[model samples]
Target: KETAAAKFERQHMDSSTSAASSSNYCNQMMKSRNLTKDRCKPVNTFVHESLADVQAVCSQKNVACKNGQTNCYQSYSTMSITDCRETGSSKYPNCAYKTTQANKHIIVACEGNPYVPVHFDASV
Candidate 1:
């Protein structure tokens, strides 16, 4: 079974892609990463940082999750990230995305015995 930590790593972490130079980045990544399986994910973020750096967010300042949970944390340093938003004309099996790269502090939800980041809440 895929753990929450593993799922988060698959969906958000992309240390290899340090910079997004092409608009097709999200289009290719969203599909290759299996985020476009059943339907297009309206919005998703890929963090270009080391796994340890991302995991360290759990120990940062705590914040409220979007759902009102209190387990969220924000990173202290700005991170390289690419925001992927589905295009207006995107249709199933043809998930087109707009890629925008920026440096921002990331917000994430943490959980489990080891207390690692399990969900990417937002970027601010």
Candidate 2:
């Protein structure tokens, strides 16, 4: 079974690559990472920081989740990330995304024993 922490790593972490230099990065990554399986994920962000650094956000300031969950936190420092937004022409099984790179404070939802990140709420 995939733990919440592990799922977060797969869906959000991308430290192996630098800030995307090509626009195709999101299109390739979104498919390769399985975010575009039966349907496309409209918007997602990939953090280009070390796992440890990303995990550390759990210790940052607290915030309310979009649905009012209390487990969310916002990073104190801006981090490098790539935003993947499905393009207007995007279709299922052929997801097309617009790639954008930016440095921003990220919000994530944490849970479980060690209180690690579970869901990537958003980037601010």
Candidate 3:
């Protein structure tokens, strides 16, 4: 049984990887290629659609739904606004490289007596 705090911490830390990667990319690009910060802004996270995908995955995993809602999960809360060099051209951009912001509200409902892990995503 994973508590909400544990879930939040896990998710928060998981998302930070993207920030660190972006920072490293910026540093490398500047140090090696002399690129400006404006040339490489931190990848915007918080994709809304990715959230839906996460919800679907959790649903498949048989996680409990929150507030009687089904298929709740974690995903990007924002859409990609720009493309990064490592991600290739804009025509075929890699949205996954962008980070996702934490949701103000998170809803996760456990099922059964053990209250096993279920669909959990930042909401509200």
Indicate which candidate wins on TM-score: 1
What range of 10 consecutive residues in model 2 has the weakest lDDT sum?
16-25
Better of 1 and 3 by TM-score: 1
lDDT tens digits, residue span 8-87, model 1: 99899999977763898999889988999988989999999999999999999899999999999999999999999999
Superposed model 3: Cα runs more than 4 Å off: 1-95
Q: Estimate each model's TM-score.
A: 0.97, 0.96, 0.26
Whole-model lDDT, model 3: 0.33
Q: Measured by C-alpha RMSD in angstroms, how accurate is candidate 2?
A: 0.9
Candidate 1, residue 28: the lDDT equals 89
Candidate 3 lDDT over 1-124, as tens digits, reads 9674344233322322333345344334322322232344233222223333333333333333555565454323332211223334322122223222333333443343343324334344
Worst 10 residues of 3 by lDDT: 90-99
Scored against the true structure, residue 3 in model 3 reaches a CA lDDT of 70
Q: For residues 33-61, could you state the per-residue lDDT of candidate 2 as single tens digits?
A: 88999799999899999999999999998
- Backbone clashes in each candidate structure, one number apiece? 0, 0, 7
Q: Model 2 clash tally?
A: 0
> How does each model score on lDDT?
0.94, 0.92, 0.33
Q: Rank the candidates by TM-score, best first.
A: 1, 2, 3
Better of 2 and 3 by lDDT: 2
